[model samples]
Target: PNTISGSNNTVRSGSKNVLAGNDNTVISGDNNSVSGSNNTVVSGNDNTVTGSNHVVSGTNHIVTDNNNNVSGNDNNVSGSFHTVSGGHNTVSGSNNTVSGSNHVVSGSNKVVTD
Candidate 1:
């Protein structure tokens, strides 16, 4: 399944995954993707989840392989009891619970999996 918000939503994939976003964003290849204004993703693996009570606002959100890409921003993400893989990703805003691997975070006060 796929979801969208705002204007001009788009996605491209070769796997049974979900892509979601708004305004000139693209998710290509295999896996699930969540993006925002003027964002782009080559692809993600089969991993997606939801944030319990967090705020993700701004732009792009990405995840790969049993991962959680949560946020309303560019690409902030979080998940539990899962595995994330890839080059690297980032989380933004304040107060969050993130998990999995291959992630970089910025902000003050948050939670996650080691």
Candidate 2:
């Protein structure tokens, strides 16, 4: 069974979806996609996320947005594809792309754009 714990979270149209943490949202997707606190995901399949205040849309996204004792925050990942292994304050946008750990691609934004 899929498990979801926390408050004010919405998960819909998906199978085998697991969500942990607060204020997380997922929709119109399937295949074991997971989400963390205050993160938003949409229309994506087989995606995994761990972090707070992150946003991901599209497909096949795997994100490690934040961790304890590690700086990972306020990251935004979008578009038809991408994998974001971010450190802190990163943003990856559109098409095929990847963001490395602790690697600041842009100033304060930390955006990876295709």
Candidate 3:
């Protein structure tokens, strides 16, 4: 379980004229989001995201697993039915799927995992 956290603005996202506060969604693993306005995400039993603006759904996604999931603002992780935990290029958009390892946040120097 190796995690990677980001700074104050790890995940920067904003919708169009109307759907300004949008995230993502998952269907198989688990999803964990932190701070945001309107984000819809879930994990496939265990997949997860530490930041906001997402929806993950899976299995065995224990908030840790760099090879797991990905989906930041207005994004969604449907199924790879695995794990995804990171923020750098972790969450890119909606309809995202993660799978595989090492995702953990070892410090709190304004770090953000999404």
Candidate 4:
């Protein structure tokens, strides 16, 4: 039972963890991680996350998002206003959307505009 709450905290290599703070995040497992005041994340087993207003749902996923979202397994993503769903994918940059498995996308500004 690992649980934490505060501001700008750091945690790694943990399980069944929970966190709540401001602009503070890290990596872990079974981890139901959440941060308010600009950053938030909830990941599956063996997952990693960082960034603001972001959420990752899946297994073995590493994500960094500023206003972005991801859901799948074994995926790596970074950027803003983007959404990804699938497995074994690496994404970066902003405004890009993906839905599939095993893909790599990068650069700033792509499909879907606001």
Candidate 5:
């Protein structure tokens, strides 16, 4: 399979691919499948990114072969600075803040709990 999804949602020669979504985007590849919320994946094989800032880049990963995975909520596969690369990934819920791959943060902040 060759798929790329958005707010919507890779494998094998390399395994089982998946990529999923949210926040404004979602992505996928290879034998890939992805769920939802700030999503990203660039490559192939067993890649799964589901909800809240998702990402996996380069040769492909998530579940095996390249090893890229972001479970749910607050995700960052640690690919670094944007350009993308292989992954040794893992992220899961709580507060929600993920980063890596051409890392960048510049702007404002002013909003506390309720």
Candidate 6:
């Protein structure tokens, strides 16, 4: 592994593990793992996940947007990739990619093999 840094993170054998939004371009080797904020795992020949819980976040939540990208009548309304044409909405989910209009999509909020 190379240039690895962070708090509350783990990397088994991969290189370039970063916490402060620069942990991109990860090439995984034998028994490799990474978990951090603004982290990414992409564009590596051997990069893969073979075992269970290869990567994990204790809190298990990530929102990819700015404060200006969010506005709501309540804490539940505040989030990323949200567009409110009308009606109040809230979302609690995982691995979600959405576009267009007000909506709510929640998925698999649970822990596994812990």
RMSD in angstroms, all models? 9.7, 8.8, 14.4, 5.7, 10.9, 13.6
What lDDT tens digits, residue by residue, belong to model 1 across residues 23-95? 4333553444444344344443433323222222223344322223343323434442222222345655444
* Per-residue accuracy of model 2 over 63-94 as CA lDDT, tens digit each: 65442111123334433233454434243433
Candidate 3 or 2, higher lDDT: 2
The local lDDT score (0 to 100) that residue 81 gets in candidate 3 is 28
lDDT of 6 at 102: 46
| C-alpha local distance difference test of each model | 0.41, 0.53, 0.30, 0.67, 0.36, 0.31
Q: Lowest-scoring 10 consecutive residues by lDDT in candidate 6?
A: 50-59
**1-114, model 5: which lDDT tens digit per residue?**
334344433222322443333332223334445555545554433444444454454343332222233332222343322222323323322222334433322222211111
lDDT of 6 by residue, 1-114 (tens): 454454434444455444332332243332223333433333222222211122221111122322212222221222333322222334444433332334565553322110
User: How many residue pairs clash (N, CA or C atoms closer than 3 angstroms) in each of the candidate models, in the order given?
Assistant: 11, 0, 60, 0, 36, 0
Q: Candidate 4, which ten residues in sequence have the lowest lDDT sum?
A: 34-43
Choose the strongest candidate by TM-score: 4
lDDT of 3 by residue, 1-114 (tens): 112132322232221111122333332222233333323333233333443443333333222222233432222222222233433233222233332232322312222332
TM-score of 5: 0.34
Q: Which rank order by lDDT, best down to worst? A: 4, 2, 1, 5, 6, 3
**For model 1, where is the 10-residue window of minimal lDDT?**
49-58
Specify the highest-lDDT model's number: 4
Overall local distance difference test of candidate 1 = 0.41
Give the least accurate 10-residue stretch of model 3, judged by summed lDDT.
12-21
* Structural similarity to truth (TM-score) of each candidate: 0.32, 0.54, 0.23, 0.68, 0.34, 0.23
